[PDB]
Amino acid sequence: MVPISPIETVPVKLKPGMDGPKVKQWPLTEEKIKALVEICTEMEKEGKISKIGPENPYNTPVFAIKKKDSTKWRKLVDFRELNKRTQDFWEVQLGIPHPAGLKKKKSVTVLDVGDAYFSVPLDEDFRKYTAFTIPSINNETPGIRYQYNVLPQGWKGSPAIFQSSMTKILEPFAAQNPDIVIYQYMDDLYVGSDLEIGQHRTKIEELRQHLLRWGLTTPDKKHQKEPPFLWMGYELHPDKWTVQPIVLPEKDSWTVNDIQKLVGKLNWASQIYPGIKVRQLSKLLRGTKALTEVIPLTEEAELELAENREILKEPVHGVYYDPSKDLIAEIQKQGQGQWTYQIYQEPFKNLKTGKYARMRGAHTNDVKQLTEAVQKITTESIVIWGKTPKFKLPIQKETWETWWTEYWQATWIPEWEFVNTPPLVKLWYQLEKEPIVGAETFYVDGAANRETKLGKAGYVTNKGRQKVVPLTNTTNQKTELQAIYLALQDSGLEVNIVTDSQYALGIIQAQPDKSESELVNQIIEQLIKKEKVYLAWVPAHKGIGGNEQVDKLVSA
Amino acid sequence: IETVPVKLKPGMDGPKVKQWPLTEEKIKALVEICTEMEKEGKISKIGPENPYNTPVFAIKKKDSTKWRKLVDFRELNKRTQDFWEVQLGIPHPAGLKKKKSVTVLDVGDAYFSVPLDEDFRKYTAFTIPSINNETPGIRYQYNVLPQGWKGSPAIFQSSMTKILEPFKKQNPDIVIYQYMDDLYVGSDLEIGQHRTKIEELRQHLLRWGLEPPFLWMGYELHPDKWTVQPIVLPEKDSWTVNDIQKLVGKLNWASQIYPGIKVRQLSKLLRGTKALTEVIPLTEEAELELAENREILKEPVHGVYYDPSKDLIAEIQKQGQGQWTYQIYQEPFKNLKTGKYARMRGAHTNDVKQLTEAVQKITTESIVIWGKTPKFKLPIQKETWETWWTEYWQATWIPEWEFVNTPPLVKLWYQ
Ligand SMILES: Cc1cc(/C=C/C#N)cc(C)c1Nc1ccnc(Nc2ccc(C#N)cc2)n1
Ligand SMILES: [Mg+2]
Structure with a gap:
């Protein structure tokens, strides 16, 4: 036999202070038990699990699930409890490539590495935590006890440890072959290149030889899957990419949940379909999370949907980088x-x-x-x-x-x-940086009674122009904006405005052109019509002339 | 040669900070830097059983052609135990800010000579990302004291005092202060003599080194001449209404800092509802109040302590x-x-x-x-x-x- 390099195991720990799982095995039908015993005999023959004695105090439940439309049973070990107790790992797919950053490739071959997927060794010190029991027929003998020697599917650490192990194997091949790309996804390797297909297929054979150094065999009969690839909601082609087909349903009535599905699809589509819009359709999910409630579609949302349908009428593709x-x-x-x-x-x-x-x-x-x-x-x-x-x-x-x-x-x-x-x-x-010569000066002020919500807003100017307006259902802050609005409304094209409102100044110094407050929007509309506006702040209650006068007028 | 034991603060896990996006040029630079550091034994590749992470990027220091690796240990520094095994602290030298010249040296490379406690290394994990995540990020951890970690100057301190014992008794009037990876060296000499003693200092650490990539640099400060900004009021011959409003506004603000500030007489110049650009003659109660405020503003603020x-x-x-x-x-x-x-x-x-x-x-x-x-x-x-x-x-x-x-x-x- 040819010696193979072993794959070094990753040392694994439980979270601090936690012990392994001790979960009771559910009773099973005589039928399921016989199926599990045969399944486990084969797995044991291949080295994936080993029989253990009654020393080991841990346990994880095992189930037998029927493959729909077949006599074959399938073994499911429920690792939910062990996963809660297993340490966190570095997850490397904390980010998937976006197709738009990929490079065009002349050839992309797929290679099946499922036989390594279930053959990476588990840290010897951790195996005991993976113990499970096949119940005995009629419960008249001890159940058969096994533990895992390889990464179990469904265990929290298997995807991270499998990926890090495959990466380590592939690293020297990729480094010494910089004219190819390799990408691992589930139990497949995707190898792309711009090489003439002869050289490309040479590299593929060389990669198969490299993998044999670890005893990883790949199937000969070349893979079923060929370009285009369906991957992560995209279609990848050799020289272009797109999202998988987006089809917006016809409906007479839209529930909350249909609207969420529609926005999700539109968001997905927006990465290659230009001009997609979702504002009006998202506005209908405002606040409510009653997932079966039906919502009328505003004329606005109906128009947005119509626009989106037109955008989505024919397929659009992106190019590569x-x-x-x-x-x-x-x-x-x-x-x-x-x-x-x-x-x-x-x-x-x-x-x-x-x-x-x-x-x-x-x-x-x-x-x-x-x-x-x-x-x-x-x-x-x-x-x-x-x-x-x-x-x-x-x-x-x-x-x-x-x-x-x-x-x-x-x-x-x-x-x-x-x-x-x-x-x-x-x-x-x-706004102006300096007071305007020849422009009328408006000293504005407002005040409201917090109990009654009654207030006043107004101004006095150097020309003797004056106005005070009584207001209901208002606050000090609203009356200060109202006073500025009245000064804008009643002045000519150039105006100096003096306020003591730190609140109004904070807003205007932010330079909004749109507000949720309709009073701010009215102020903005007045500002747009002016030629020159100088806004001056003074401290309140300091006997500042003009300011003190209208403070008395409005706080009465 | 032997490791100091280091722990995190109680009830505190290691940092798990997400690597921020890096440009192509910073990635390539970090790949080169880390390949060399790994060959030199300073860092080692790590596996997926290490879930920790600290962000890394690269900078070009002031006036240079070479990238420097910069690890953002802010989170790890918050979570690392406080260091007063040997020293309750290095009581900060108040003379440093009074020297006529202070030169800042990057001495962080010296830290690479001390191994890091094997049980703490995992918490220094970092990742070199790849563009578009097309290949797995390269994962490393430190085997030696990292630059930018708060424990590094603490653990290296005993070493550092020994290296500069000669230079210090030979130059007893020089203030040397170390902060993280920087050494601040302050003299009252003329800048040519200053530059010489700085290069003198560099030689001690080159000699002890037997190469540091950025030791030869010097950031020169002159804290001697560092300027402050007292509150000052305008001196004018003509005051508009607007000028006096701004003055009263400024003095009202200042009165929160300085108790005895008054604006009453200045406010009385406003009273009418005057045009903003109209010139107002200062009355004398106003001129006096203004002069009194000016003198208040020449004194320090009361009750200010560090x-x-x-x-x-x-x-x-x-x-x-x-x-x-x-x-x-x-x-x-x-x-x-x-x-x-x-x-x-x-x-x-x-x-x-x-x-x-x-x-x-x-x-x-x-x-x-x-x-x-x-x-x-x-x-x-x-x-x-x-x-x-x-x-x-x-x-x-x-x-x-x-x-x-x-x-x-x-x-x-x-x-
Ligand atoms: C991320 C990725 C997913 C798949 C495949 C996943 C599937 N399922 C296949 C490969 C080879 C890669 N890696 C890279 C890296 C750089 N450029 C490219 N370009 C590229 C990839 C695929 C196609 C196709 N035709 C065309 C160009 N792929
Ligand atoms: Mg008021």
């Missing part, structure tokens, strides 16, 4: 906090697409949202391709310069160019 | 045109240091690079003055900071930070 070319990312504003993007290298050949949704917040503006979309695309691109794409953005260079230079926060977006495709992101207003 | 048991907090404001102001404090309105920068280099079109350089300079000042790093309140969205700061980082330590999302009114007053 060419590392010799720049990556370009183009972003469009879609409305209602929705943004969409495409990443490509050649015009009209996307690598992938995607979308970004406005964060939940009280106030916002387009420039902040575009900025966040850029950071998210940047980070996703680092993951997929290891580099930042060049951006094509619907915002003028002068607009960005004005924004970043005057914004109170530090902010930055990487190398980008203006793309003139409406709707453009713009600054809807900018 | 407490080594409390965190230092650093706040930063963007002032525009490349200018940044900052304050270091432990209690609100009790500033231990204030300051202002403008020379943010190589960043006139990049706010985030400028902020990152400010953070590093403030941290350096904090280390020199108190021997610890502050917690930053950063005027930036978390997603923007987290995407970019590692591109501009050149220090071998990393402080803690949080994010300010509401605009501070007080930015005006530090301007």
Whole structure:
């Protein structure tokens, strides 16, 4: 016989202070027992399990499950209790490749490594924790006791230990053959290359020879599976990729659960189908989690669905990554906090697409949202391709310069160019840095009684213009915004406004162009119509003239 | 040659921090660095029974052509036992901040000469990711004291005092302070003599070494000339209504820091409902109050003391045109240091690079003055900071930070 290198075992421990499982074996039918005894005799003949004596105090339940539509039984060892007690492992699939970062391949062969899948040795000191018992016929003898010698399917550590063991085996082959790629998924090896199929099939044979060094045999009759591969919800082809078919159902009535399924499919589709939208369809799941409740579809959601159906009418494919070319990312504003993007290298050949949704917040503006979309695309691109794409953005260079230079926060977006495709992101207003000569000065104030919720808002100006409005169902903060609104409404095109409201100043200094508060939205609409606005803050209750006067008027 | 036993704090598992996305160039750099470190025995590959992780990346230190590995041990440092087996601490040298020149040396490579306790090594696990996760990340752990871990200078301290015993008695007026991987060396000599003694010092550790990749560098500070920012009021011949409003606003703010500040007489100049741009003559009760406030503002703040048991907090404001102001404090309105920068280099079109350089300079000042790093309140969205700061980082330590999302009114007053 040819000596084979043994696979070093991974040392395994229970979580600190825990003992192994001691779970009672369910009684089984005479029929199931005989099936389990034969199953285990074969497994024992192959070395996967060994009989043990009654010393071992651990136990895990074993079951016999009928393969649907067959006389054959199947053995199921239920490791749920041992898994709770087994240490955590390093999981290496804490991240799956995205197809858009893959490289085009001339050939991809699949090799079956199922016979190593069930042949990696288990740490000798841990085997005792895997003990199980086949019950005896009529319970008149001791059950037959076994423990595992190899990684058991369904045990918490098996996928991580199997993958780390196969990786270690493959590492020198991959290192000395940099003209191929190897990827392990379940019990298959996928080997791709750009080699002429002769050389490619040579490497495949050399890989089979390399695997034999560990006694890992691979089937001769070449694998059933060929390109295209169905994998992780995608279709992988030699030179393009797509998501598996997305078919949106027809329904007269939509439950909560159908709406969740629909949004999930749309989100999946949005990585290659450009322009997918889900805002209005997601708005219907707001708050409620009664998974069988039927919801009427707003005209808005009906329109979104219609748009999406058109986008999904015919198949769309992505191309693979060419590392010799720049990556370009183009972003469009879609409305209602929705943004969409495409990443490509050649015009009209996307690598992938995607979308970004406005964060939940009280106030916002387009420039902040575009900025966040850029950071998210940047980070996703680092993951997929290891580099930042060049951006094509619907915002003028002068607009960005004005924004970043005057914004109170530090902010930055990487190398980008203006793309003139409406709707453009713009600054809807900018406050003055200095008081305006010749513009009327409005001293504004508001106050409310917290008990009654009654209040007043108003202003007095240097021209003697004055207004006070009585208000109901209001708060101090709302009346301070109302006062600013009244000053904007009643002034000319240029105006100086003096407030003592730290709250209003905090909002306006954030430069919103849209708010959840309809009062803030009205202020924004007034600001957009002005030519010049200077907003000045003073401390309250300091006898500041004009301020003190309207404070008395409104707090009465 | 023998390992000091090290433990985590009680009821505390090892770090399990997720590796952040790395660019292709940083990955390739880390693969080269770690291949060599593994050959030299400093790190070893680990298996899946080790579930711990600490992030890693790579930097190019100030003025260099070579990548440096930087492990972000912030989480492991929080979870590692405190170190007062031999030393309750190294009482921080108050003379360091008074020297005319301080040079900062990267001496972290010396730590690679001491083995790490075999039972603690697992907690130093890290991963070199692969682009698009196409191949399994390369997993390693340290066999020797790692750079950036708080235990490393502690365990190496006995070694380090012995190496510099000669240089210290030969130069008894030089202050030497070690923080993490840095050695701070302060002299009052002229900079040419200073540079010589620094190179003198480098030779001791080259000799003891028998090669350190970044020992030859020197970051030169002159804490002698470090400037502060008292509160100052405008001196004007004509005051508009707007000017006086801003003055009363600033003085009201200052009165939270300085008790005896008054605004009553200044407020009385406002009273009418006047145009903002109208010039107001100062009455004399107002001029006197203003002069009294000016003199109050020339004195130090009352009851300001440093407490080594409390965190230092650093706040930063963007002032525009490349200018940044900052304050270091432990209690609100009790500033231990204030300051202002403008020379943010190589960043006139990049706010985030400028902020990152400010953070590093403030941290350096904090280390020199108190021997610890502050917690930053950063005027930036978390997603923007987290995407970019590692591109501009050149220090071998990393402080803690949080994010300010509401605009501070007080930015005006530090301007
Ligand atoms: C991640 C991955 C999944 C599968 C397969 C999973 C399946 N199931 C197969 C392979 C070979 C890989 N690994 C890589 C790595 C780099 N480029 C590529 N390009 C590439 C891969 C597949 C096809 C196909 N045709 C075309 C190009 N694949
Ligand atoms: Mg008031």
